[PDB]
Amino acid sequence: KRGHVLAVPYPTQGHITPFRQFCKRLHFKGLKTTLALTTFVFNSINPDLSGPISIATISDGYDHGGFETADSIDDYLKDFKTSGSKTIADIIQKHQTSDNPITCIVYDAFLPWALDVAREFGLVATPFFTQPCAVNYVYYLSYINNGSLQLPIEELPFLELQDLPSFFSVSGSYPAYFEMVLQQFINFEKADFVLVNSFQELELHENELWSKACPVLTIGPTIPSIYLDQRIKSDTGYDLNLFESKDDSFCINWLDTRPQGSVVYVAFGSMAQLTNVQMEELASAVSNFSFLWVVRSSEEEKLPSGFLETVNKEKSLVLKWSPQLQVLSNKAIGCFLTHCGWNSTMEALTFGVPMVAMPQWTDQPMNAKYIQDVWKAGVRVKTEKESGIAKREEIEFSIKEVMEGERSKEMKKNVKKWRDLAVKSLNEGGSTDTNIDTFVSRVQ
Ligand SMILES: O=c1ccn([C@@H]2O[C@H](COP(=O)(O)OP(=O)(O)O)[C@@H](O)[C@H]2O)c(=O)[nH]1
Ligand SMILES: *[C@@H]1O[C@H](CO)[C@@H](O)[C@H](O[C@@H]2O[C@H](CO)[C@@H](O)[C@H](O)[C@H]2O)[C@H]1O
Ligand SMILES: *[C@@H]1O[C@H](CO)[C@@H](O)[C@H](O)[C@H]1O
Ligand SMILES: O=C(O)c1ccccc1Br
């Protein structure tokens, strides 16, 4: 009972959730964990604090308003390193006299500066990569090559420019984020271990490649235990949400009244914004189906005028936020029109829901390439090269490819092989269970 992990996610939903899920696994294995949330995120959730995972607050330098009150991404990341370094140190110091002092920092790989704090205090230090091995390996090759990528990549020759992370195909876009994803590797060799939110059997070749450069430990998927291995019965869902849902049994009750495989689920995660023009092509394409579409509140204005009040309440539903795990497990879902965020992707793969891939930016084009041509679990929507927009007829065609065709019948069979592979990996003797055991042993 000696070890104590302080877990520091990048402060977005897609990073907080896999960190929190990993903490529930460590707790089941007997390791105490404290999750570090920024003050702004803490004061927006109002989390429940009678749980097996404690919460500490740190500062990114923007406690009042959060990221949206920062001038720029570069200012934000630099203030986060300043304020985060000082406030992580503060948490460590505050726990020193305690029964269980902090012994280990599991920090988001996006934040390599946390390793320096961990090393100043003599702690175990491990970066946690929330993106899959293939993406991280590609970023690692570019970091080694001063930020450039010569296609083709000898070890992954099937990758084309349009399959790379958007930083490589959209020149100069988001330079602060591009620098951040490359600098994940500035010191990762010096960590005790390198953790990855994936499972070995999903990316055998890429995991093998990346491990030659640095031993990594796959400890995923971070899907709650009740849906896969079921060894942790208290792990029944995602219980740290930055977005409010209208308590929606209403959403799952509505899907219960629908025929099997008949509903098109559409969602673009927590962050990605589509333009007016892209929302128009989408709204038109999906209106040819029974659909369940999450449109985030801030995105509603970009819908075509009067769209929300001409959804026929019998076949279709538009939500502000969904219980996506429960949706993706419901039998009424025929396919998942997704932006290919890695959590939505792994959730789709493991629930056996075939995908329509509409990637937007950072690593999503990679996940989209793997969904279609490696895991063969869906089709990527075609976007016009000059305009960059996926037009309504191309979106409707891709959904039909996944719902009905001969392609369709194949991608169903292929996507259900992955649930069992993950269950095996999380069960005793599996790849992920052993790797988590190795990490727990080192921490205590
Ligand atoms: O309406 C929604 C949309 C997304 N999610 C969850 O939010 C996470 C989104 O993470 P992902 O890596 O897919 O995308 P990001 O939001 O980081 O771009 C996932 O755990 C989804 O299940 C949800 O619960 N309800
Ligand atoms: C990364 O930069 C982009 C802007 O290019 C931001 O959208 C993102 O900020 C996140 O926004 C989310 C709201 O949709 C918040 O949940 C999250 O806390 C915040 O970090 C930047 O991180
Ligand atoms: C950065 O750019 C993408 C568009 O390519 C958008 O989806 C994100 O919302 C934005 O932060
Ligand atoms: O890679 C991601 O998904 C990501 C998430 C949040 C903020 C920045 C990025 Br670049």
Author numbering: 4 to 447
What did the paper state?
UGT74F1 and UGT74F2 are the enzymes responsible for the in vivo glucosylation of SA in A. thaliana. In UGT74F1, glucose is transferred to the hydroxyl of SA, creating a glucoside; in UGT74F2, glucose is transferred to the carboxylate group of SA to create a glucose ester. UDP and SA interact primarily with residues in the C- and N-terminal domain, respectively.
Collection of an anomalous X-ray diffraction set showed a single anomalous peak in the SA binding pocket.
